Design a protein around this nucleic acid. Structure first.
Length: 849
RNA sequence: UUUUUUUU
């Protein structure tokens, strides 16, 4: 072993820490504790038993309301601002099935509706179920929940359905998403929510007694949430004979779902869509006959196909198809050329280019903006070009959705983001390169990767769909039909790629204590070894004992709507009075960063960040400083001018702030704070003590450590605690920096792309790791006295410190156990604070001078 | 160097 720096502490510091610790050791409530032991002490049937009493509002109906609504439905359908849309709504395909759906719901607990774009299932099915109940004089027994994957969907659909009923939002229709609602009346109502909303409500209503019809939408996307929720319905439905579930799906492996609920009824409702012709690589080449400019397999693949098509393509269009580079988006000039070909032949209408990511979007944009080509600068000032990317701003504007200045043709360069999430309406032409990026997880290298791959059949049929919303259009797929037959049906179901810590933990609140056995029953079962890794992580942060059973701290973490590691971070920040900065770090990790990356300004966004970082060498503290600066700009009425000069999204910034306030109100209700204000003075008296902040951050992100080793932009020799070589991601504020006060870092996500990168990081000090971590041992290996952490990092430490530190840990552990089991704010002049002050004092030794 | 989404 090789020893790191000395962490020994001054005598007079040690002694005061010893006075403080013994002040803590001298001292001589519990509604939470009783809920905790109650959860552990009941079986499943008692659990089901008791959640039914406590949730029985729908057993009560209001007959005078049933009859009045029923009267006003019969009468509103004779008025006329209410049969335009009855005629209009009845020209949607779903309405042809109205009676048949009603009948199918009546006869079955679970039906499946399979539809496609335009079919109207999402807007009409809940209105058919509702109106059926009002008409039959059953209004008040009817509460309908329709889940969506996305926040924006939930809103727009609710508004539209509400508009179709000539009601303001809040009446028969509403929506609910994280921290924003327009709730509908309790009974005779339809509510559109994100799936995760419902899944959090399960904790209070684990058997869904508080709704009559559940409509799961868009399940074919195989999000973790709908996958989880279909798996839970298999537990819930046997004890809820009268609950109705309608599954709804696009035409993307529909039979899987049908098969999953024994073999339930299935409707196929058609979409409303213009014809779109599908040209493949051989056909695009055959019309542009562009030529290309300076592993096989690739003609092992391409040549049996090339024969079956000897007769029907030109001489050697068969050419380029032998070129590996002809497919995908290797050659951006090919693509730019196809943009030009569409610009002069084929009538007007926007072009939508699908490229795998930021880099290629950038190349193609520059090639149009400053062109080499003869047929480039003719067209330059007759194209309205927008790049479209999650990290770019143009999406959340409006200039991209409205049609172009006349004489100009709109061109959209985009990631997969325009497949479902973002919709442009004058698109007539789609160039589908067939290339995208996806995250992947190797289960026993622990490397998460970001890889360019071929799209799926599912992605292509959707992309094609995007061409035909306003008029017959065309989808150009820059790969060959031989490529397509190698392509997969659908993406990998995200639950097969995800970490399961929060899922395993949250199942405990639903009285599902065996994660292996429940998870195994999903449409696609996760690798059991991933589950194991999940459990060990929760065992390590002590959310579970080593039986696998919930700890008092684990219950608190389960109840916070954030990943457990960052929950632990937030609770700790309540104890050590640093709520505001840490909840910022927490919120930004959980959601995303408020910075754009607008094309070409990479260099000066880099410079904004480094300035916001204030030399604190922390991506996480940089976001907090950003929020501090944001708050002031608002106080100064300079909000827009601030967000503009600093490449920041004001709407990410506000959402970050609603999240922090959510964590502060929750922490108050759980009795960790005396105030629900995230900015409260008492809650924040240590929020400027940067070494302390680093410690609590480290407390959350532990055990993700990394250690930098050499000098020398600047080049780095850094390796995570597992031994693997990493570098700071260049988007991170620590990339290329030199002269850190410490060689140690914590990180939330590591990700392999061009290299194995730490996506985010905070410089931490050895003593902070040692106090809050584990694997702490005091020994002598050379003839030096050491003190270690995680049995991985060994620091020189005299033994008078090793002993105070080890005692400090023993006290820190006892205190944390007791705050979890009997939550109360830490009294400012009580015995517990003494121990807090003890820890603060040791950590202050590493203040930057 | 920067696929994308979500939380009573």
């Amino acid at each position: 072993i090789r020893l790191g720096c000395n962490v020994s502490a001054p005598s007079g510091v040690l002694e005061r820490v010893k006075e403080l610790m013994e002040d803590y050791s001298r001292a001589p409530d519990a509604k939470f504790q009783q809920q905790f032991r109650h959860l552990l002490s009941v079986n499943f049937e008692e659990f089901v038993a008791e959640t039914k009493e406590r949730n029985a509002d729908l057993d009560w109906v209001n007959p005078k309301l049933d009859e009045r609504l029923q009267l006003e439905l019969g009468q509103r359908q004779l008025e006329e601002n209410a049969k335009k849309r009855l005629e209009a709504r009845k020209k949607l395909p779903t309405m042809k099935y109205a009676d048949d759906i009603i009948q199918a719901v009546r006869e079955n607990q679970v039906i499946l509706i399979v539809g496609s774009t335009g079919c109207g299932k999402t807007t009409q099915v809940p209105q058919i179920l509702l109106d059926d109940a009002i008409s039959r004089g059953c209004a008040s027994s009817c509460r309908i929940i329709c889940t969506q994957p996305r926040r924006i969907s939930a809103i727009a659909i609710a508004e539209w359905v509400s508009y179709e009923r000539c009601e303001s939002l809040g009446n028969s229709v509403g929506y609910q998403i994280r921290l924003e609602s327009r709730k509908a009346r309790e009974r005779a109502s339809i509510t559109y929510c994100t799936t995760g909303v419902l899944l959090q409500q399960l904790q209070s209503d684990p058997l869904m007694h508080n709704l009559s019809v559940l409509i799961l939408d868009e399940i074919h996307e195989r999000s973790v949430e709908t996958d989880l929720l279909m798996g839970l319905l298999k537990v819930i439905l046997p004890h809820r004979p009268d609950l109705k579930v309608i599954l709804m799906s696009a035409t993307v492996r529909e039979q899987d779902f049908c098969d999953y609920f024994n073999n339930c009824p299935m409707f196929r409702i058609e979409g409303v869509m213009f014809p779109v012709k599908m040209l493949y690589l051989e056909d695009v080449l055959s019309k542009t006959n562009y030529e290309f400019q300076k592993r096989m397999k690739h003609e092992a693949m391409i040549e049996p196909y090339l024969r079956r098509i000897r007769n029907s393509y030109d001489s050697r269009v068969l050419d380029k198809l032998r070129l590996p580079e002809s497919e995908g988006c290797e050659d951006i000039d090919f693509i730019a050329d196809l943009v030009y070909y569409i610009c002069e032949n084929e009538p007007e209408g926007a072009i939508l280019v699908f490229l795998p990511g930021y880099d290629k979007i950038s190349q193609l944009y520059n090639i149009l903006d400053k062109p080499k080509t003869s047929k480039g600068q003719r067209w330059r000032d007759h194209m309205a070009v927008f790049p479209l990317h999650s990290l770019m701003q143009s999406g959340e504007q409006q200039a991209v959705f409205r049609r172009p200045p006349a004489g100009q043709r709109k061109v959209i360069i985009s990631t997969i983001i325009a497949e479902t999430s973002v919709t442009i309406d004058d698109v007539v032409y789609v160039i589908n390169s067939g290339r995208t990026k996806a995250t992947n997880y190797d289960i026993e290298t622990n490397i998460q990767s970001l890889d360019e791959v071929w799209v799926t059949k599912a992605n292509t049929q959707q992309r094609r769909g995007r061409a035909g919303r306003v008029r017959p259009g065309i989808c150009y797929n820059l790969f060959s039909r031989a490529r397509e037959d190698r392509m997969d049906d659908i993406p990998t179901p995200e639950i097969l790629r995800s970490k399961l810590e929060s899922i395993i933990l949250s199942l405990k609140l639903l009285h599902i204590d065996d994660p292996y056995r429940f998870l195994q029953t999903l449409i696609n079962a996760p690798n059991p070894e991933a589950i194991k890794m999940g459990v060990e992580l929760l065992k390590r942060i002590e959310a579970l004992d080593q039986t696998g059973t919930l700890t008092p701290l684990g219950m608190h973490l389960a109840k916070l709507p954030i990943d457990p590691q960052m929950g632990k971070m937030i609770l700790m920040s309540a104890l050590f009075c640093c709520l505001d900065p840490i909840t910022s770090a927490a919120a930004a990790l959980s959601f995303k960063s408020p910075f754009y990356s607008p094309l070409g300004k990479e260099s000066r966004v880099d410079e904004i960040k480094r300035r916001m970082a204030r030399n604190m060498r922390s991506d996480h503290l940089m976001v907090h400083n950003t929020i501090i600066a944001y708050r002031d700009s608002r106080y100064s009425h300079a909000e827009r001018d601030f967000c503009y000069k600093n490449f920041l999204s004001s709407m990410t910034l506000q959402q970050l702030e609603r999240m922090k306030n959510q964590f502060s109100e929750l922490l108050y209700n759980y009795k960790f704070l005396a105030s629900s204000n995230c900015k409260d003075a008492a809650s924040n008296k240590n929020s400027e003590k940067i070494p302390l902040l680093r410690a609590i951050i480290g407390a959350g992100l532990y055990p993700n450590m990394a250690h930098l080793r050499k000098s020398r932009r600047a080049i780095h020799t850094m390796a995570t605690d597992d031994g693997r070589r990493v570098n700071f991601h260049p988007s991170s504020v620590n990339s290329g920096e030199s002269g850190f006060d410490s060689a140690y870092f914590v990180y939330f996500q590591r990700q392999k792309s061009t290299d194995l990168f730490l996506l985010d990081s905070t410089m931490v000090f050895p003593m902070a790791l040692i106090i809050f971590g584990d694997g702490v041992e005091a020994g002598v290996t050379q003839n030096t006295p050491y003190l270690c952490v995680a049995k991985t990092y060994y620091f020189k430490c005299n033994r008078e410190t090793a002993d105070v530190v080890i005692q400090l840990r023993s006290n820190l552990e006892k205190l944390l156990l007791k705050k979890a089991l009997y939550p109360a704010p830490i009294e400012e002049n009580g015995y517990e604070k003494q121990l807090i002050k003890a820890i603060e004092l040791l950590l202050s030794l590493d203040e930057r001078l």
